[PDB]
Amino acid sequence: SLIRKKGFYKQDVNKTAWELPKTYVSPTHVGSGAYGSVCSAIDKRSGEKVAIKKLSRPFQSEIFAKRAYRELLLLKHMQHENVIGLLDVFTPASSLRNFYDFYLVMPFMQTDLQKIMGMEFSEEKIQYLVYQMLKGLKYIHSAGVVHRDLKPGNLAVNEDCELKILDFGLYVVTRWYRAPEVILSWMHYNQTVDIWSVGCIMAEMLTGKTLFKGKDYLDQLTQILKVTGVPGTEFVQKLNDKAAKSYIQSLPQTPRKDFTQLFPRASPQAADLLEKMLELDVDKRLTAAQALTHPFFEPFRDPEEETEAQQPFDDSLEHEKLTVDEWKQHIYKEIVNFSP
Ligand SMILES: O=C(Nc1ccc(Oc2ccncc2)cc1)c1ccnc(N2CCOCC2)c1
Structure with missing residues (x-):
């Protein structure tokens, strides 16, 4: 003892x-x-x-x-x-x-991206950081894990701008980086919810300003639509929220973008990539794997570094309802069973 x-x-x-x-x-x-x-x-x-x-x-x-x-x-x-x-x-x-x-x-x-944000950012730096983001996202996704809450505060960096994703598998909290379909739950979300977040983060690196804010979900939506433009019939039909669908059909139908005009300093390749990540239609929005193939990353791309998990994250107790004592038993064993 x-x-x-x-x-x-x-x-x-x-x-x-x-x-x-x-x-x-x-x-x-x-x-x-x-x-x-x-x-x-x-x-x-x-x-x-x-x-x-x-x-x-x-x-x-x-x-x-x-x-x-x-x-x-x-x-x-x-x-x-x-x-x-x-x-x-x-x-x-x-x-x-x-x-x-x-x-x-x-x-x-x-440090992390939230703490070093705002400082102009060259496109080469953006290319490098975002490329690392996508690789990490490709990996966790391939394990069946979505972040859901990706934000600069969640992207850790060292002095060499090496990047690791944090806090994956997580009134009015700020939701600037969150996917529209999550904030409005107006259709079912897939793994590309994280890609929307990358788009918001990349855009912020380009301009120095947060892309989307708003006091409430409706004002955030109004800010989002200024950028994506009001979505067409193809998208409207996928909505499972008839009240939201109605609201969208009843808007001044303002056509989409020219991301070249919204981001007048961005390179064509960067604007193009942005266009494809900031996509309302969760079936058309780029996956991590697909975004990794985009020309914006040509200088850094190494297919070999773009690995997948070999095994899906498999927690059989994910759903279980146990006693604190039983939980301690499992946590205890995992610690024993661990090896560095
Ligand atoms: O990154 C994580 N944890 C973590 C991140 C940063 C950290 O602090 C650091 C790490 C490295 N350098 C500086 C600070 C400590 C823990 C992490 C990953 C996956 N799931 C997590 N959770 C989901 C369930 O409940 C909340 C915790 C946390």
């Missing part, structure tokens, strides 16, 4: 107590979040900088335990350059009675 496993040491980080293995040193506060907090550290074994996430009271309710479990499984399942992944998982606990929390170890990312 022990207080914590050997080789662990107690240290305060950002005025909270952290219990870390010896191999991780010089922990340094990074951020405090909704369900945990993060620090950086040096893996003295390799001297490389990692990020360590302390889960906060993951076992306080079935909802917290599932979520914490889900994050672990997803990070573990994805193996891709542009998708955040797992280097290590640990807990100071020595038994189930001990089991209060666990730590996720991941590669350290200096």
Whole structure:
């Protein structure tokens, strides 16, 4: 019987107590979040900088335990350059009675797109970043996983502009990057909801300004339609929301675009790619794989880097309804069963 496993040491980080293995040193506060907090550290074994996430009271309710479990499984399942992944998982606990929390170890990312946004952006930089986005999206999609909430705050970068996607498999919150069909639920969505997000993010890189805002979903829609133009009969028919369909048929039918005019500084190839991602029709909107073939990425394209998951993300317990204690049992085993 022990207080914590050997080789662990107690240290305060950002005025909270952290219990870390010896191999991780010089922990340094990074951020405090909704369900945990993060620090950086040096893996003295390799001297490389990692990020360590302390889960906060993951076992306080079935909802917290599932979520914490889900994050672990997803990070573990994805193996891709542009998708955040797992280097290590640990807990100071020595038994189930001990089991209060666990730590996720991941590669350290200096910053994110939300924090370096606004600064003009050359098209070459845009080509490079967006190309990495699409590759990561192609990978998670191929595993049957959609992000649903892609945003600059979710795209981590280092100083070399290497990119990894975060937080995949997640009144009036801001929904600037969200797909119309999700905000209005006016037809069923596919994996190309994330592509809409990429379009909004790319557009913002080009101009320095958020593409779509609005106090409420209707004003956002009005801003979206200024750009996409009012959709034609082919699209209108696919709508499963008759009230929305009515509303759309009753609008001043303002024709689409000329994205060359909406983005008067964009290259033809960039405007063309934008046109195909900012597409209302979820059946015509580009997939990640298809957008990767676009000429806008010619200088960076390497088909070999455009991998797919070999296996679909398969959580048999995704639907299950279990007791917090049972959840801890599974999370506990996964941690034991893990290997770096
Ligand atoms: O990226 C993730 N986690 C994560 C991202 C960044 C992070 O902090 C870092 C990482 C690297 N460098 C700096 C900070 C810590 C955890 C992540 C992936 C997939 N699913 C996630 N969840 C879905 C279920 O509930 C919410 C959690 C989280």
